[PDB]
């Protein structure tokens, strides 16, 4: 589990969104595994607006932040699970790292701010849904 809290927005994995998220919906995209809802309180996270391919992510199944190198946001094939049919997820970045079911929502960050959230795992790989192109999160 986990979210990004920027401005009056809450960014979560679409597959983990709650009823309150759906009832206060701003934007959602199943192909990216992202959903954004509105919040009453202002958040403290800032979004990175950069070209980094190195950063650090939080892994809840290890209680640890790991440094990683990650690929550029791309259209990647993700294996069928109980949340999605085998398919192509867009704006996804891959790294080598531990990610097990329960780790989605952990933040990936660089020196500029939040880059994205854990969206996939398995095989010693971790996939991150990028948010750096969502410029409207800053307004
Ligand atoms: N964004 C997605 O399509 C994810 C939906 C939630 C489930 N996804 C995963 O990657 C899960 C299922 C297989 C394993 S092993 N460690 N994590 C996972 C895929
Ligand atoms: Zn950066």
Curated annotation (Swiss-Prot):
Catalytic activity, reaction form: Selective cleavage of Tyr-|-Gly bond in the picornavirus polyprotein
Binding locations of Zn(2+) 1: 50, 52, 110, 112
Top-level taxon of origin: Viruses
Active site (UniProt): 15, 33, 104
Record function comment: Cysteine protease that cleaves viral polyprotein and specific host proteins. It is responsible for the autocatalytic cleavage between the P1 and P2 regions, which is the first cleavage occurring in the polyprotein. Also cleaves the host translation initiation factor EIF4G1, in order to shut down the capped cellular mRNA translation. Inhibits the host nucleus-cytoplasm protein and RNA trafficking by cleaving host members of the nuclear pores. Counteracts stress granule formation probably by antagonizing its assembly or promoting its dissassembly.
Oligomer status and interactors: Homodimer.
Name of the featured protein: Protease 2A
Source organism of this protein record: Coxsackievirus A16 (strain G-10)
Segment of the intact protein contained: 869 to 1007 of 2193
């Amino acid at each position: 589990s986990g979210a990004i809290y920027v401005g009056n927005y809450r960014v979560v994995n679409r597959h983990l969104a709650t009823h309150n998220d759906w009832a206060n919906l701003v934007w959602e995209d199943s192909s990216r595994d992202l959903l954004v809802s509105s919040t009453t309180a202002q958040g403290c996270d800032t979004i990175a607006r950069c070209d980094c391919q190195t950063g650090v992510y939080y892994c809840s199944s290890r209680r640890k932040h790991y440094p990683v190198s990650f690929s550029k946001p791309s259209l990647i094939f993700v294996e069928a699970s109980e949340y999605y049919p085998a398919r192509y997820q867009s704006h996804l970045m891959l790294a080598v790292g531990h990610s097990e079911p329960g780790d989605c929502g952990g933040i990936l960050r660089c020196q500029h701010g939040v880059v994205g959230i854990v969206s996939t795992g398995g095989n010693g790989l971790v996939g991150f849904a990028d948010v750096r192109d969502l410029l409207w999160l800053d307004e």
